[PDB]
């Protein structure tokens, strides 16, 4: 971990009616140590045992930023706040001891690699607290994202609570919008390109204008590939202002439109409001 | 080769000054100063520095070794002059209607 | 907020064959104000009210970036697009008001604390429009990200579609993935170490090699801790392929193997194509 000095200003009321050469002499140590702090963090830090960040393997910036690596030596330190790091546990366990953070401080982290396992955890010291978690958070998770923020400072105490998630994966709904039932009584939504997921799980909200009757299912799909179909489970149905133990409220039908699973949403009652969200979804990739 | 020059990007200190304003141009200079020449010279050049020449001091006669020069307009040669004409107006025939 | 102005850039055809001096003290303004907008980013504005983001004290920079805290009364101005901002409404429900924005720009904001609520909303003028969102967006969400994003600008129109996001939490999938059901016609795979979650709940989907035999099913899971064991319910089952309204085209056992929850997904059919997909978990922790 290359050490950065914050920001440290030039005098302008220097140069031309001072010695020029001295009072520049000292500007550059600023600008110099200035640039290393951007550089360092958004980009390698062990560059600086390189040309300094200099030349053209020189730290540069990343738009996304860098994930500051290091040795455990480094983190055997209380580490400050604000930093992004990614550390391998596949070593060995860490503690990554963080400094008394202010509200709001955050700490970035993360595992590229994923070699973070029960084998390889990860131990975490954010002084005085970290929301949540009595003592310090280990982390066993591989491709895992530590990300801690400060909650509360105070006087003494800083207080973290704690996010972290996998730093991969398909995270994305197809199909979340709202919409009345139509004078129709219905509508069509294509919900994903009819190829995007071999299967998916929504959630439709059928609520009256006046908002009485409102209709809820819980629908499970499976996309029928050959058949261009969709098959649906429904099931743990509530309603409120049903007016028949039957299908009330609205009905919920389904399809594939225009190369988009598409639900047919039908209500004998005008004025609906439907929500229509889907909620998880599943693909099948390649085998491993 | 002495040159009246730098402080550019009109910084303070120059002094320099051309000065659009009024209808006109406004163009200072400070007063100049010559010696050692150890030479007959006649003539000044006011050369720009970034090549060709803005004007020419006759000097009027030929000096030896130095040379002070004011400007009597007050230390600014020049003020440039656009007052009053209009090109176009020619005269022609006319039918008085009436 | 202290006001960047955009990148300004020193003449080198200036210096040796120059002014020195003048054309630095210039040079210099440039530069201050450069890093100003740097260190601003990534730092306290409200650090410029100090040395001016200079000394110790100063304005760092922080490879997580820095989101501004300030005033209402800043903000009572339309903010520019491109800015981190944290601000809590514990004082009072804010309006942050947005200039008019280009086609991906972006606007990051956070309550650190929380203190947004009903009792401390949060409204939003993106100048024309906020996709979804008629007139100001309000939001109550305690430890809520505002993150607005310009999907369209155009020539009069700033469409804003919005994002939001709960700052912390747990939200990684132990388990996804896809592989092909062996020759021996199943297999186990670890979900997760088996103390990370006291429930799980997953989504399988067993295709054919041609996919004409694709296997669904609804999978929920108690973790059984004292006896190391995994309770599951299946319901809402779903097929296309199937030859038999018995279990068919692939069956679903469980286990845990290895300090794994360990999933057996057996197919009496060969080259069955099954992604195993984790879309929910719980644990427990600590009370309160």
Not at chain 1, 198 to 205: C, E, H, P, R, S
């Amino acid at each position: 971990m290359f050490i950065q000095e914050p920001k440290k200003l030039i005098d302008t009321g220097e140069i031309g009616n001072a010695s020029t050469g001295d009072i520049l002499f000292d500007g550059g140590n600023k600008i110099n140590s200035d640039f290393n702090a951007i550089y360092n963090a958004f980009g390698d830090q062990r560059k600086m045992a390189v040309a300094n960040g200099t030349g053209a393997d020189g730290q540069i910036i990343h738009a996304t930023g860098y994930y500051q690596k290091h040795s455990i030596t480094e983190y055997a330190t209380p580490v400050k706040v604000g930093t992004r790091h990614d550390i391998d546990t596949s070593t060995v366990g860490v503690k990554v001891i963080i400094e008394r953070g202010e509200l709001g401080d955050c700490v970035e982290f993360i595992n590229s690699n994923g070699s973070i396992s029960v084998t390889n955890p990860l131990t975490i010291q954010a002084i005085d607290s970290i929301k949540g978690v009595s003592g310090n958070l280990v982390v066993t998770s591989p491709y895992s994202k530590v990300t801690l923020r400060c909650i509360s400072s105070d006087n003494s105490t800083s207080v973290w609570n704690y996010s972290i998630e996998s730093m991969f994966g398909q995270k994305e709904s197809p199909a979340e919008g709202t919409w009345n039932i139509s004078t129709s009584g219905s509508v069509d939504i294509p919900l994903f390109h009819r190829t995007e997921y071999n299967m998916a799980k929504l959630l439709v909200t059928c609520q009256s204008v006046d908002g009485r009757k409102i209709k809820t299912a819980e629908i499970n799909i499976l996309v029928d590939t050959v058949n261009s179909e969709v098959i649906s489970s429904e099931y743990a149905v509530m309603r409120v202002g049903n007016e028949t133990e039957e299908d009330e409220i609205a009905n919920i039908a389904f399809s594939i439109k225009e190369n988009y699973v598409t639900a047919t949403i039908s209500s004998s009652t005008v004025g609906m409001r439907a929500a229509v969200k889907v909620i998880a979804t599943q693909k099948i990739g390649v085998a491993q | 080769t002495k040159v009246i020059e730098n402080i550019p990007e009109t910084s303070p200190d120059r002094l320099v000054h051309e000065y659009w304003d009024d209808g006109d141009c406004t163009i200072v200079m400070p007063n100049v100063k010559f010696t050692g020449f150890k030479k007959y010279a006649s003539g000044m050049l006011f050369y720009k520095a970034s090549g060709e020449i803005i004007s020419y001091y006759d000097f009027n006669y030929r000096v030896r070794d130095t040379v002070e020069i004011i400007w009597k307009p007050t230390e600014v040669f020049l003020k440039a002059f656009l007052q009053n004409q209009e090109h176009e107006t020619p005269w022609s025939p006319e039918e008085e209607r009436g």
